[PDB]
Design a protein around this ligand. Sequence first.
Ligand SMILES: NC(=O)c1ccc[n+]([C@@H]2O[C@H](COP(=O)([O-])OP(=O)(O)OC[C@H]3O[C@@H](n4cnc5c(N)ncnc54)[C@H](O)[C@@H]3O)[C@@H](O)[C@H]2O)c1
Ligand SMILES: NC(=O)c1ccc[n+]([C@@H]2O[C@H](COP(=O)([O-])OP(=O)(O)OC[C@H]3O[C@@H](n4cnc5c(N)ncnc54)[C@H](O)[C@@H]3O)[C@@H](O)[C@H]2O)c1
Ligand SMILES: [Ca+2]
Ligand SMILES: [Ca+2]
Ligand code: NA
Ligand code: NA
Ligand code: NA
Ligand code: NA
Lengths: 486, 486, 486, 486
Amino acid sequence: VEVRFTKLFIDGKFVDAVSGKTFETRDPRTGEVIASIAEGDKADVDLAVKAAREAFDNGPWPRMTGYERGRILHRFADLIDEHVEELAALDTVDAGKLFAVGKARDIPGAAHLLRYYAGAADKVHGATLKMAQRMHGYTLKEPVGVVGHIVPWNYPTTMFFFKVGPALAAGCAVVVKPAEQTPLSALFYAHLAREAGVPAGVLNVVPGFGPTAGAAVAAHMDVDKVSFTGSTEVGRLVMRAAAESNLKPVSLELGGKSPVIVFDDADLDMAVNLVNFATYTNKGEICVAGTRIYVQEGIYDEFVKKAAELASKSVVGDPFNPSVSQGPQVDKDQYEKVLRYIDIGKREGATLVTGGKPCGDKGYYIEPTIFTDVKDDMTIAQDEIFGPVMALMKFKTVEEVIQKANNTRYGLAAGIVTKNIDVANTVSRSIRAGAIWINCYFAFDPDAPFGGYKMSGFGKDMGMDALDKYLQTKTVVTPLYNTPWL
Amino acid sequence: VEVRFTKLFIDGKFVDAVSGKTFETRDPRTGEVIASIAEGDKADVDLAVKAAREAFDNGPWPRMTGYERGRILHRFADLIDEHVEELAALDTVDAGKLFAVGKARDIPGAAHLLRYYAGAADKVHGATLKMAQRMHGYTLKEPVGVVGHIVPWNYPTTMFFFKVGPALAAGCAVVVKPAEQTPLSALFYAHLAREAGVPAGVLNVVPGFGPTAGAAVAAHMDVDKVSFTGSTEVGRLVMRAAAESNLKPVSLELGGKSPVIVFDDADLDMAVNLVNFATYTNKGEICVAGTRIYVQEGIYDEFVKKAAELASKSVVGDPFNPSVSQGPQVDKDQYEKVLRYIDIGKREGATLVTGGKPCGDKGYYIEPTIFTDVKDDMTIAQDEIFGPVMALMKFKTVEEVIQKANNTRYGLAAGIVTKNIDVANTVSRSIRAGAIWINCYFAFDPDAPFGGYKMSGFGKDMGMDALDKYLQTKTVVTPLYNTPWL
Amino acid sequence: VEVRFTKLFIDGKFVDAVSGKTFETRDPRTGEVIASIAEGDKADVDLAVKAAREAFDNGPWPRMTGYERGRILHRFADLIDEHVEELAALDTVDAGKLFAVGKARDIPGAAHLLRYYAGAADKVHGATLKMAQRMHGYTLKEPVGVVGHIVPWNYPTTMFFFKVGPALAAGCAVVVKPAEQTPLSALFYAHLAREAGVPAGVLNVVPGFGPTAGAAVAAHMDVDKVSFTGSTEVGRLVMRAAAESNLKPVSLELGGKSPVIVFDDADLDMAVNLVNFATYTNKGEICVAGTRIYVQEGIYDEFVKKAAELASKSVVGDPFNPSVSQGPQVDKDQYEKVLRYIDIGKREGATLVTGGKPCGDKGYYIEPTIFTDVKDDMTIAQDEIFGPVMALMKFKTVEEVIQKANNTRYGLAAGIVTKNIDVANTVSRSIRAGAIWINCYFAFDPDAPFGGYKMSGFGKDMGMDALDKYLQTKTVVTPLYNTPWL
Amino acid sequence: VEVRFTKLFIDGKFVDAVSGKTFETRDPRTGEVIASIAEGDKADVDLAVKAAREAFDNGPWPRMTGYERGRILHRFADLIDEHVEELAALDTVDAGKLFAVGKARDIPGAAHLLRYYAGAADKVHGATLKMAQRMHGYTLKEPVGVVGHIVPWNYPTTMFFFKVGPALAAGCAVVVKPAEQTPLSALFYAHLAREAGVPAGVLNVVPGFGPTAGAAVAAHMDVDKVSFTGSTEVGRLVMRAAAESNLKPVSLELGGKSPVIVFDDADLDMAVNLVNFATYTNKGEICVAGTRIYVQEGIYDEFVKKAAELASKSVVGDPFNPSVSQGPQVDKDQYEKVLRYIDIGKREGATLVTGGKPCGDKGYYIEPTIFTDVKDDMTIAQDEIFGPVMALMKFKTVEEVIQKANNTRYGLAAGIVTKNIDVANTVSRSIRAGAIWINCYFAFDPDAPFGGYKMSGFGKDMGMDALDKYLQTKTVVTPLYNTPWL
Ligand SMILES: NC(=O)c1ccc[n+]([C@@H]2O[C@H](COP(=O)([O-])OP(=O)(O)OC[C@H]3O[C@@H](n4cnc5c(N)ncnc54)[C@H](O)[C@@H]3O)[C@@H](O)[C@H]2O)c1
Ligand SMILES: NC(=O)c1ccc[n+]([C@@H]2O[C@H](COP(=O)([O-])OP(=O)(O)OC[C@H]3O[C@@H](n4cnc5c(N)ncnc54)[C@H](O)[C@@H]3O)[C@@H](O)[C@H]2O)c1
Ligand SMILES: [Ca+2]
Ligand SMILES: [Ca+2]
Ligand code: NA
Ligand code: NA
Ligand code: NA
Ligand code: NA
């Protein structure tokens, strides 16, 4: 895989870091260096924010009609689609993601999401109000201004567009800080945005480390809003940094411990295939991965046997190979962390059914893992592993499983497998999670808002809701004289 | 039962008709005269429209804030609740409706629907637009003006408020023409509206005949909008009258031939009790009555036996008696029409399972009727009977029953009885009817819009949609100069 | 100008009329025959409705996701943009419209409007309701089905897309009946729709006469909705035809008698230039043309003199010539009708200031006309002329001008020229017209709903409102069990 | 004035603090002790949160229909209205607020705002989505859960209801921590809520100090959301406390430095009376007080003379006296802080036009103060004083004044005084503040959202927006089978 975009993207230009420093990105297949990327720090973020400030305050982008920003975003989406193979290859080498899924789903899904916001750009509405005095009131929806985005490594393309798509459609100027593990595709997008007609300073990309570049975005006095996706720990630092700088609003997606509930009436093969998909997609490196599987007692035993057969059949290997179902973990730290959690599961008394060990000659490959006899307060039942590890459990009643599903500090997503309308309605309304997937999984859609409850964070990505977070509501009021109606 | 309100209500006053004429209202229990009511004609409608015109053009009502119209409507709703016994008694003697249901459901349901619109009155919003030019655009929601309402006899109170509630909340002045069979409660409401603080000319009630008073409302040159509920035939006359007068928009609720579909997986006792409820409530005198019952072959035989037991045991008699489940038909014409359809049913080859004959010494009482071996092309399977008559049929497949459900001129409502989520979703999306009731029936709610497809008419009653039909949308646009965002 | 599309477009094919008959389209520049077009009658409309019925009931179009219908409409909009010169030329020869305006505004404005609906296609929302019982209620937005569009000759492209854009985005199948005077561009669009991927039977175009083909669409038993733009007289026949056939809902845009109000604080040159634009654009052949000009007494005299100078400077001639400001009237009937109205103005005592006579050797050219000393009840002050004729009047007070502006049976649009915020708010809220243009004119926008009050008709074209008229609202309700919240 | 409610209100009961401790509330008119109030600390907040948790998790309140919560809130609003004199008297003695304004505006305005949310309770809607797959998606609006409210002393009643009204309407259980300076009316409301039928644990009121009780609410592990109104400094502490506890979302109203811009074309007497009203209402103790007055050069000199006349004649004294226009500052700290800013104003070179000194024998009375020759970089032009102090300045151009208006850390509200439509539109769109009041001031309305930009905070109080912050959006998705439309 070739890398042509390695510098920072500030003010419509690819530039080196002020320090002249570079950091390395590694391929999880081998641990070998892919490329050396310019290492942005506080000085580079300051330059990107100044570029974003100039583009918003005096530049053409927010002054454009919504229709003309949409036309530019539609051209940007078309360019993504023409570089689909190169973009998927970049994400496969940077993050260990399956190339076939990158081409078929991930990269076109990003272009599709950017089309959704491009189509929303000329349809943004405020309200005309109903005053309880002889006055005319209305609200204006205005771009927030300079927005700072801090993004993780698991879905580099997807996360980039969840943030960039709605913010740019709203008329904002952005500074994106991609994960140190995955800076590649974000620099390619900065190049495509420029080609599409996105003006200089509207999209700034500052690759670099978290406590340096990432913290500089969160603490910036001239950034109006920050949207952050990543760990619960860093989410606390981002929220604190906003409080101690300029009181900028913040939106956070902090991961979860997603339960999947399988009832007695489920089709066994469908439910096994669905749970396998929920747990092992992207080597378990997803904020919404099925992690706690609750299977009703009537089908429990047959489910365990089928889940074990299917997991052990999974082809683990080179993500570029189309016969491969599971690639390596992102890097060494993640790989080692998943191994520690697997050891924890064994140490606390859970039963290892399949996997639970690394595989292959080289690379960060871990066997799809199933633990049974998992108790609700166990570490593997409470902590986000972010790896190919399932906690398989049994339940008797609906009331009992609702309590189990909600026995977590998280609340991002949940899966329900049942044919009964009443069970589906009772369970979906009772689980404290932002997204409920009934007889499907990872049912993300550009039109559907996505965001957590509890420690999964707050604010939405996707849907019209995401567009609304990059718009301020301004109330304007004037008295009325001789009105024939009120 | 005593009648104290017998005159027309025009310009905040109870007045006699210009002609001095009166018509009689009869008790369906005996055919006896209840009271003599002032008979409004074209001259009285002209006086009511002039009163409504003055109240809208120069009066305080549309000039009030939404909050202050809401406070008056809240007072109006409270007054309804304090006169529940008297109001229910009036609708029983006038329409042959059950007194216990009047007190428990019908009359408080009207006060409740009035509170829903009172609460919407101060929350009406238009939009601020997203112009594709350097312009500021917005929409204003203004009261339509003078509204004419033509209502039927089946739910006198309910129909009155479906129309009056949203129109008064919006700031309109109304002219109500109640059915000749049921003018009583509408005059009591005109008295309560005045007591609540509804200004003179805002709510006018002109009891009288259809081709005289009703036609005068539909054809009026100074009525801005008309809402009609009743027969398909008259609906054609109302729509035509609007076209040949001032091109006022209309909304029409024209009744239906509602199917109820019972699948193999339903709880038989629940399904039987639900269908019995759907077919026989208010002696079948409902636009949404369950008329065509489709029962899947696996449970068909047991369903027929159980449906016949419930229909045959049903207590037919005095609607004032709390042990009575079914009162008399509204009047002689309706009673005779139901009897003609029962006779056509027999002559066309259907099987009479139960009823199919009048009962009692006096009054317009008809036995709950079940016909089996009903073919889709039969008159009783195609025409609205508006009586206690069920057409009970069998089906094998989902695809077959979707076609059967849609094999009608109408599209008002449909019932589905199944526990399976997928069947419920497939069937509900496939039936061309405005309201789909899954595992329930008559699930009307102030927040839920109600209106037909096909020959059942167009426009909505109930929900925020009903409020929207009494508001005009006015687009206002001005250029913008030196805007820092667009 | 070359004509390559002359046949009917039924079921994705260009076909001759069942009768084999053809009618001629003439060029208003000469009165010479442009082309012979297949003459559709009741038999051809029946074939188009059957094609539309098959495409909706069993075809892929409504089964597509909103996103995929949008992608097809975006391709359709791109194709319009690449045939901009040919399309403008067709509209110039068929309707006598300025070629420079066709290329710069009319044709790209249509492609732009189709992009607006393409972008709305994947964002259509219903509601989840707030039930006052232990129930879950929601609304579904479903395509209405087979839609019939009857369109006038004044803006052939614009009118076509106002109707087709939202109906196709919603998932409907259409039968368009273009005006006999302007069938050309509509057949070119049918060809472009097919090229874009619009499936067979989704867009049917039946050129032909009004009482034959047009009446056949309005009276069709299998058309679910009709949208009509044209004369008040025909609007009555369309509404009546719906009432006497299947009770299909109807939306009507019936023309107007638009007032423009100029206050004492207006910039004289700006207001004169604005009024000149409002009155004479498209030779006065617009439903929203400035027809009644009210100028405040303080500036009245200077306004008349300036309006006369400017009108007499107007270059009347060949619409293909870029130096020409005003083309010929559509045809002989329109030309003669405008001349009769000019004679009426003189006959009833109005003062002819400029024009009021035909000009040139050949073609249907009429001089821009100004009448002063126009009284409010005069025929030229009350009737839609649809020609280059201004009724210039004086007023003293705001209260007086509000009454004058509303002294009409129409209510489509109005213009206000003032710098004062309070006058603008009082006047805009008091004029009973669907569109208020403050210090601008013809401020149409894809995001702004457009539709009349009073005899201008009802229903909206443009904005999200237009999309809503091709969608039915279906209420679906189910009970809830053990819900932790309601 | 008598005080009957002095204890904490936890779990539907008036209880003493766990410690048995009490704190004193003083009358700003004398510095005299009014009453001794139970002093809530971390232990009492823990008991209130447990009561709120029980009421939400297992209690009837969120299980009620929206309509039934609305009926209780309507009863609650009626009770407020019957105790208006007593309620106003309590806020006068506690906050030094005018008694006449309490009775006429403040207390009935709270009952009115409570009616607005009661009316919204049965109308809360989510959406049915437009999926880009063969799936059915929808959103549910569910109560957030347990909500903590931290309120200031300036508008005790108003602030209480801005928070409590929408949160209770949404189905939440609340813990309110009123300001130590103003705990009185909040305990009276807790008593009225109970009387109205608000269930035990739904509304808890914990009077007490900020770093103790207030910090305990902000840092609570079982509080789902927090709303804070007060100083910027504490706002940082609240946001940080959320980040370091459970990552609960916050909303913050942090005050401002509101500019009022008077253009050359304003009616001088109207503009002067409006600015006087904006600056001195509630002795300048308002987050939206007019603080920086910018007057255009053409009228500057006459404005200063007229503003000084009105400020100097203003009746300062007993807030119980109806002839009094300005009461004392809340307490000693506020009084001393205003005096320090007056001294900084003089020391930094500003010109004292009037006031600038304390008045009277006893009480915290400060003379209405005007400073001229105020430069944009001065402390009195940059810091929120929260006192009767005006910074009166001159400007030449629109562009200049837009920059001056935005030369602040804050962005809460701004006033514009002009008759010109274009200046009003340009200026209103250009000022970075949440509320723009044109030719009026303090134009708050239950239907109008209110919230700041920049360092004034984020989130809205009032309008439907306030209701939305107490509702979670849950996305629910299921596949579809054999759908005839998508
Ligand atoms: N859809 C409904 O809710 C509903 C209700 C009652 C009756 N109906 C249908 O109608 C049958 C009974 O007929 P009906 O005479 O009672 O109904 P109808 O349609 O004649 O009467 C409904 C209302 O319209 C008025 N009306 C009658 N003729 C009119 C005219 N020419 N112009 C204007 N208004 C006119 C009536 O006075 C009454 O107020 C029933 O068997 C049933 O099929 C439907
Ligand atoms: N924005 C507003 O509406 C508003 C209102 C009142 C005061 N203020 C500002 O604050 C100044 C006065 O300061 P103040 O002490 O009265 O305001 P404050 O910010 O200290 O108090 C507001 C509320 O927060 C509570 N609080 C205080 N310290 C807390 C802490 N550590 N954690 C949690 N809650 C805590 C208080 O008890 C009170 O209920 C004024 O001069 C003005 O600038 C702003
Ligand atoms: Ca009749
Ligand atoms: Ca403090
Ligand atoms: Na990497
Ligand atoms: Na009767
Ligand atoms: Na022609
Ligand atoms: Na006090």
